[PDB]
Design a protein around this ligand. Structure first.
Ligand code: NA
Lengths: 302, 302
């Protein structure tokens, strides 16, 4: 038994992290086959970040301006090409440690694992969730730029995030591996702020189902609320509206526990209005919203 | 910025995970050099689990009774010996993925990364802390036996924990990599109970420091306390006594925050007395004690 926030094993991703340096800037890169993916602002100086024109900046750069190091093996940059907001540096050597991989764009409320890296060396791994406001509440320091977010499904790695910048509120923004930013964010130094974040309601319900599976049942009640009556309460507490698809997705968990989705919603409704009155759920004093219904099934097979 | 429970990169440990089968029992094993380490209860028969004599069970087993599989490759068992509660299987092949490693027995209050495994296949990685009662709060299901806990220092993997069983309360117990159990437990299916779980005080102080680094300062206070006066309050609320060494280890966090360790002690003393008053530190209504001072420094720019 037990339920913990779990990251995917990071071995397949570690073998693709290289150190990319351009000028006086150093960040991380993802080495897949003969291509190294890194954020395109590596070609930016500190003073150019105010209003960088990447088209001319990249064209003024030459191949030898890109110092790619895989550990201490120096990789020769054969070419550089713009990939939206990330760079595609071609190297002469394919990565022997290249795993079965795919580029996937996740939706808000979905989770993934982050392999935090500094100077091309992995430092830690944790689990994140794409917030409704298209940011992530990660742990990124200076030089973490280029750290990648991924999921793993049967030895196939689904890369979904690359870290680019930290927003003023401390949350972090980035792109998918195709170079397209999540949310309205752009890779320049402008007055940028994340929108008002909301709580992933379906994830909380999945987490509550995980608590019931593991024996934590004190929050259950005889009540059953309509989908709309729950949603009105949820809006007042900055919770995402629950959709019918969310109810459908929570179907397997409802069957495994024998508790109807709307019955569990009444439990969450009461929890929102009354609080946890000092009690804990799965060792937590807050309503966790970073476990997808899939994330629960993995840790709670039936 | 940002603070999260961060597990070490699991790549070096993934290469040592193998599947061990004995009779009808299958659990995970640790393949280092030409030796496979796994919990000795793999040789237990179904109805012998209540109170087994492993010396009998080992004499009833030969080398070819152990099925060891590293992925698709079957491993030949040359020898087998019992070291306390750990089964050592000698194989004809040294593991080519064996990293630099050592066997250490961590102290209570220390944290380590757990690589949860099933059928010799890693499935997730998360952070665990050795509770003062020598239990850990993890996510272990059937087949997770042999899942290992480790810390990484530079290129060296310090193996410190192998999972053996789950206590009735749902907490988890295991041994060091030499077969010696953490705490008073024995690998039998009896009614064992862990001791009373006190709170790791030095970890709470580090967590409060990690909060100050990440913005949360509401709990902060001007008055200070001596070590002995704080220890009296800590003893009342089942907190571990705070030694001078704990004060020294917290020094780096004090330097980054500009807050004396004894001043943070007074802020914790106030919190233990008047409680939360409905506020949160780092998104939690309770005090976290599963982050060591080293764990906080890893995520904070000193
Ligand atoms: Na209910």
């Amino acid at each position: 038994s037990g339920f913990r926030k779990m990251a995917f094993p990071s071995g397949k991703v570690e073998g693709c992290m290289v150190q990319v340096t351009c000028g006086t800037t150093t960040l991380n890169g993802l080495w897949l086959d003969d291509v190294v993916y890194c954020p395109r602002h590596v070609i930016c100086t500190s003073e150019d970040m105010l209003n960088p024109n990447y088209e001319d900046l990249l064209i003024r750069k030459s191949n030898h301006n890109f110092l790619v190091q895989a550990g201490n093996v120096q990789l020769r940059v054969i070419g550089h090409s713009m990939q939206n907001c990330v760079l595609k540096l071609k190297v002469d050597t394919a990565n022997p440690k290249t795993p079965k991989y795919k580029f996937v764009r996740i939706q808000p409320g979905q989770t993934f694992s982050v392999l935090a890296c500094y100077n091309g060396s992995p430092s830690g791994v944790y689990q994140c969730a794409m917030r409704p406001n298209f940011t992530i509440k990660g742990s990124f320091l200076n030089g973490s730029c280029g750290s990648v977010g991924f999921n793993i499904d049967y030895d196939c790695v689904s890369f979904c995030y690359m870290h680019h910048m930290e927003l003023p509120t401390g949350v972090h923004a980035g792109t998918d591996l195709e170079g397209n930013f999540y949310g309205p964010f752009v890779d320049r130094q402008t007055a940028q702020a994340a929108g008002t974040d909301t709580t992933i309601t379906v994830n909380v319900l999945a987490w509550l189902y995980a608590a019931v599976i593991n024996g934590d049942r004190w929050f259950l009640n005889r009540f059953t609320t309509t989908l709309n009556d729950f949603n009105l309460v949820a809006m007042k507490y900055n919770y995402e509206p629950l959709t019918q698809d969310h109810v459908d997705i929570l179907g397997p968990l409802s069957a495994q526990t024998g508790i109807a989705v709307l019955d569990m919603c009444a439990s969450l409704k009461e929890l929102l209005q009354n609080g946890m009155n000092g009690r804990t759920i799965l060792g937590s004093a807050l309503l966790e919203d970073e476990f997808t219904p899939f994330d629960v099934v993995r840790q709670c097979p039936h």
